[PDB]
Design a binder for this molecule. Structure first.
Ligand code: A1AKV
Length: 164
């Protein structure tokens, strides 16, 4: 049910869209969240996804952290997708604004390989501070499963496609 995506490689597709609106439209099996190790969904994609679940994603995440402790940078956990998807794969990319190692971005994308198809944002882009052109390159060179990338910013989408 994904539509209006531009094909980049055999398995990677991209579209200028709000991932929350895309998730409500498609109801994918897996939506990826650009999480931090604490699953504190304050801003960016995480804040937007959480707000669409009426804060149910934050309640569930806090119970997960209380039981298991924080995730590793480069790591992930599968939780409920609530009203947006069957599951939400919370993936932690490196936040270069917090001094985290950019080499962990490839480890972050490797988490996508455990799922046949995913709706996702560019990891470590936005307020995580990494170069989005670099993040898209790591994605197509690491992910082997079917990934549908939603890029919110129009000007960034245009730059990604024209420079790919
Ligand atoms: O549009 C995106 O998908 C990303 C992540 C954002 C949606 C959470 N935005 C950006 N990423 C990197 N640099 C940027 N400069 C201006 C916008 C921008």
């Amino acid at each position: 049910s994904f539509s209006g995506y531009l094909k980049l490689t055999d398995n990677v597709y991209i579209k200028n869209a709000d991932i929350v609106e895309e998730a409500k439209k498609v109801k994918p099996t897996v939506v990826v969240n650009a999480a931090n190790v604490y699953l504190k969904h304050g801003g960016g994609v995480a804040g937007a996804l959480n707000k669409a679940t009426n804060n149910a994603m934050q309640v569930e995440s806090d119970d997960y952290i209380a039981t298991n402790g924080p995730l590793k940078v480069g790591g992930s956990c599968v939780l409920s997708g609530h009203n947006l998807a069957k599951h939400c794969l919370h993936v932690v990319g490196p936040n270069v604004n917090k001094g985290e190692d950019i080499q962990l971005l490839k480890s972050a994308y490797e988490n996508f390989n455990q799922h046949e198809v995913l709706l996702a944002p560019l990891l470590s882009a936005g307020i995580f501070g990494a170069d989005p052109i670099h993040s898209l390159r790591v994605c197509v060179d690491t992910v082997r499963t079917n990934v549908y990338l939603a890029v919110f910013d129009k000007n960034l989408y245009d730059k990604l496609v024209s420079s790919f």
